[PDB]
Amino acid sequence: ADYQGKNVVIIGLGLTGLSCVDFFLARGVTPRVMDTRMTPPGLDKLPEAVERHTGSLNDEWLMAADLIVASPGIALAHPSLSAAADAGIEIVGDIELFCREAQAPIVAITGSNGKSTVTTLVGEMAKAAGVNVGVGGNIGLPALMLLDDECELYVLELSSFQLETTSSLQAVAATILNVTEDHMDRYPFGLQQYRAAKLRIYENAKVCVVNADDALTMPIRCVSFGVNMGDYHLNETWLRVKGEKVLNVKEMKLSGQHNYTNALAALALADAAGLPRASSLKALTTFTGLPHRFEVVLEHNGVRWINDSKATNVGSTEAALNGLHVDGTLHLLLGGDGKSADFSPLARYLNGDNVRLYCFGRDGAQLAALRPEVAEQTETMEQAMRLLAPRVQPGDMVLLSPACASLDQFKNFEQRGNEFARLAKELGSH
Ligand SMILES: CCCCOc1ccc2cc(S(=O)(=O)N[C@@H](CCC(=O)O)C(=O)O)ccc2c1
């Protein structure tokens, strides 16, 4: 693709909007930028030479465009953007621009839960093998910042929003790990619309990796992973491939059944990508986990404080609660922007004499309502933590696994997690 002489418009700033801007500049094309936010991040880095429109979408700019590069953060359904598509104006995203330029195979990963883990694991498997690997997308660096001639493999986490605007992806290996309710504020046609966006990842993929335990991950053969069934399966616990033991999970630092199926998924994608199994299995024994993903930030005085701020949907929090072992009382922090999710699937894990709920953020009242008799509601996570702190006892667990976006009150789930760990360390020691 060649963009010279094109009127290009980018919707959305930040590092991703800026990576798009750099992409076009370096090609001898000056784009225009708009953001619906008044002072979006990165505005300051923008080279004065690029005109910008903030606080709203500029229809004059859009309708005059030859190409619109839409951040995953804006809906294709937005009236201004639907108008442009109706006019036949081409709309793509960063991932589409990347795929058109990429000169190395791409491993593509999406799903409601486990996608950052499996993306990171596959990158670790490549690294152990001596492969020059670029890992990013919806995790880490924006995809366009990974473009490098020396790169031998790319491993991208892709969100459903990125996939909606991508059409040139031809993955060497692609997976949807699972599909559980998320982003309903962005999918007015419900779960099947959301699933439809994720299913796009398989179009033109050399190998499709599917979850034998989750029919929604299926297209319409794929290599499969699952617990008791699949080409990659569990059998102490061993990872197996087609009946053959490959790894005793005692060698892994990660624990839990869901991280074991994450391990199969990664192995399946690495295998499809042609990485040696020895180095791939080795990476599985060295990977320690991501920050904010069920991360023990404090274990002091008989109490563990777990930062699971990366739990931004119901299915994620469920993966935290399902089979959880707590000696005393579980103090569960829930809260933020639920994205119109149905929280009732959590109810099942919240019976008993040993659970306390501390709910906050935009949807706090909705979360407290899962079990009002053991629930407390506050405006902030800080107020909730100071509320729960005096009550914690030896044998207790304090778990931040909010089931919601943090965007109503925090920059991102990382700042939420960082504030959690700060407070835990303050309230968790005399
Ligand atoms: C006009 C451009 C709009 C730019 O603003 C935005 C950019 C990206 C976004 C991503 C998403 S997002 O839906 O991907 N938000 C994450 C938030 C996770 C977290 O708490 O850190 C989630 O709930 O999965 C929502 C809104 C966005 C708005």
Q: Atom 25 in ligand 1: which residue has the minimum CA distance?
A: 73
CA-404 nearest atom, ligand 1 = 23
Give me the active site residues, please.
Answer: 115, 138, 183
Listed in order, strand segments (DSSP E) in 158-249 are 173-176, 208-211, 223-225, 232-234, 238-241, 244-248
Q: Atom 5 in ligand 1: which residue has the minimum CA distance?
A: 73
Residue 87 main-chain phi, psi, to 5 deg: -80, -5
Ordered DSSP codes for 3-59:
-TT--EEEE--HHHHHHHHHHHHTTT---EEEESSSS-TTGGGS-TTS-EEESS--H
Tokens 């998320």, residue located: 182
Ordered DSSP codes for 101-115:
H--S-EEEEE-SSSH
Q: Atom 23 in ligand 1: which residue has the minimum CA distance?
A: 405
Task: Decide if 1-92 and 93-289 have a common fold.
Answer: no
Spatial CB neighbours of 117, under 8 Å, sequence gap ≥ 6: 254, 259, 262, 266, 289, 290, 293
Query: Per CATH, is 1-92 categorized as 3.40.50.720?
Result: yes
Q: Atom 6 in ligand 1: which residue has the minimum CA distance?
A: 73
- Going from the Cα of 315 to the center of ligand 1, the distance in angstroms, rounded, reads 18
Please state which CATH class domain 93-289 belongs to.
alpha beta
- Going from the Cα of 125 to the center of ligand 1, the distance in angstroms, rounded, reads 29
Q: Which two tokens stand for residue 399?
A: 């778990």
Strand bridging mode 67-70 / 90-92: parallel
Residues whose beta carbon lies within 6 Å of some atom of ligand 1: 11-12, 35-36, 71, 73-74, 159, 183, 312, 339, 405-407, 412-413
Residue 3 main-chain phi, psi, to 5 deg: -105, 0
Spatial CB neighbours of 307, under 8 Å, sequence gap ≥ 6: 291, 292, 294, 295, 296, 297, 400, 417, 420, 421, 424
Say how many C-beta atoms besides its own lie within 10 A of residue 382's C-beta.
15
Burial letters 51-62, b for 16+ CB under 10 A, else e: ebbbeebbeebb
- Going from the Cα of 73 to the center of ligand 1, the distance in angstroms, rounded, reads 6
Which value, to the nearest 10 degrees, does the dihedral of the CA atoms of residues 240, 242, 245, 250 take?
0
Ligand 1 pocket test: pick from 407, 413, 419 the residue with the most ligand atoms within 8 Å of its Cβ. Answer: 407
C-alpha span between 304 and 374 (Å, rounded): 20
CA-161 nearest atom, ligand 1 = 14
C-alpha span between 34 and 37 (Å, rounded): 9
C-alpha span between 405 and 337 (Å, rounded): 5
Ordered DSSP codes for 339-395:
TT---GGGGGG--SSSEEEEEESTTHHHHHTTSGGGEEE-SSHHHHHHHHGGG--TT
- Extents of the domains making up the chain: 1-92, 93-289, 290-424
Q: Which residues are documented as binding site for ATP?
A: 111-117
Instruction: Tell how many helices (H) and how many strands (E) occur in the chain.
Output: 13, 20
Q: Please say whether the dihedral angle defined by the alpha carbons of residues 154, 272, 269 and 275, taken in this order, is positive or negative.
A: negative
Q: Which CATH fold topology does 290-424 show?
A: Protein-Tyrosine Phosphatase; Chain A (3.90.190)
Q: Where are the alpha helices (DSSP H) in 53-189?
A: 59-64, 79-86, 94-101, 115-128, 160-164
Hey, is 205 helix, strand or coil? coil
